């Protein structure tokens, strides 16, 4: 697993995402940016799509690093078709991966 990110807190328009394990180091550089798109799901078929609002990486001597990501659930994708939502509830914990190109394109094309 190249990235192990996970939603840890859910607010009505906010997601708090913890990157538990980062391995590629290129996912964080390009796909975890301040405007990047994430896919939030526990299954490959139906997902939330979120834009990163904020992030914070912290390292300390003894404990593990705290890479924390703020995101906002802009919509819902079901079976390749994106539905502009903003209120669909994801119950944490939820597996988070960077959104694919076809999913980001589906935001502005399926409406």
């Amino acid at each position: 697993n190249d990235i192990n990110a996970e939603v840890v807190s859910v607010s009505p328009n906010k997601l708090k995402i913890s990157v538990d394990d980062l391995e590629e180091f290129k996912i964080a550089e390009e796909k975890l940016g301040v405007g990047s798109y994430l896919r939030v799901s526990d299954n490959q078929d139906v997902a939330l799509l979120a834009i990163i609002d904020n992030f914070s990486i912290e390292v300390k001597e003894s404990q593990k690093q705290k890479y924390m990501i703020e995101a906002s659930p802009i919509g819902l994708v079901k079976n390749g078709k994106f539905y502009r939502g903003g209120d669909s509830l994801a119950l944490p914990p939820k597996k988070v991966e960077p959104a694919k190109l076809d999913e980001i394109i589906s935001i502005y094309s399926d409406s």
Partner: protein
């Protein structure tokens, strides 16, 4: 023709032939084909040979030294030309098992070898107390006597450059797992692979992404091909410091 009038024509005839990138043709295939053109031209008897086997001789993984583009732009530009071609770097360096095979012979001073070890360890290791994934490079030296090699290892330990080599005590068999722990050890600065037999046993014990950086002057080895290799020929061992 002119010197500049033939540069942009020689690259394109091998760029489409091998279907590679720009650094894989101008720095990797143009450079090797220049001396093999010069080697048959500088021969006393056999000047004209057939180019049927010329296309496979230049396709070797070694990046060959070229003297004509060493006296042309100097050592401050040729070593700067090799640095962004195969020693490409990013902002974040990933914890990979990087292997640095440097060629050490009897005319090379220990001190000039010692400065390259300090250069390799500084750039290719992150031994920070706040890392959850520290990494250190592996170092292999060859072509020298064991007495001359042991003097280098003995000096590095007195200047607090702690390393591991798979032999924690006298009479110990070579333990690959000592080198793997030294990769993740923040108190071990680098790993010293003693010889080829200790080399290939360490590749099988590593499951993470592996990179090999070989720098030599005349003698090169047969690193297995599924790895990434970088084999660069230099004149003197001090040229290696400016590339890594």
């Amino acid at each position: 023709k002119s010197f500049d009038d033939q540069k942009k024509e020689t690259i394109q005839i091998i760029k489409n032939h091998f279907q590679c990138e720009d650094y894989e043709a101008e720095h990797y295939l143009y450079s090797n084909a220049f001396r093999k053109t010069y080697d048959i031209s500088c021969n006393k008897k056999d000047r004209r040979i057939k180019k049927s086997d010329f296309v496979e001789s230049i396709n070797k993984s070694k990046v060959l030294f070229n003297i004509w583009f060493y006296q042309y732009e100097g050592r401050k530009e040729y070593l700067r030309k090799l640095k962004e071609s195969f020693i490409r770097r990013s902002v974040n360096t990933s914890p990979y098992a990087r292997f640095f095979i440097l060629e050490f012979q009897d005319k090379t001073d220990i001190k000039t070898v010692k400065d390259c070890i300090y250069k390799i360890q500084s750039n290719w290791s992150n031994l920070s107390k706040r890392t959850d994934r520290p990494y250190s490079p592996f170092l292999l030296f060859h072509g020298t006597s064991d007495a001359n090699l042991y003097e280098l290892k003995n000096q590095l330990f007195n200047e607090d450059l702690i390393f591991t080599d798979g032999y924690p005590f006298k009479g110990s068999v070579f333990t690959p797992k000592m080198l793997i722990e030294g990769f993740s050890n923040k108190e071990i600065h680098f790993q010293f692979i003693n010889d080829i037999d200790d080399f290939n046993e360490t590749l099988n014990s590593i499951n993470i992404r592996k990179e090999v950086y070989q720098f030599y002057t005349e003698n090169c080895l047969d690193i297995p091909s599924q790895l990434p290799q970088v084999n660069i020929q230099v004149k003197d061992f001090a040229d290696i410091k400016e590339i890594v």
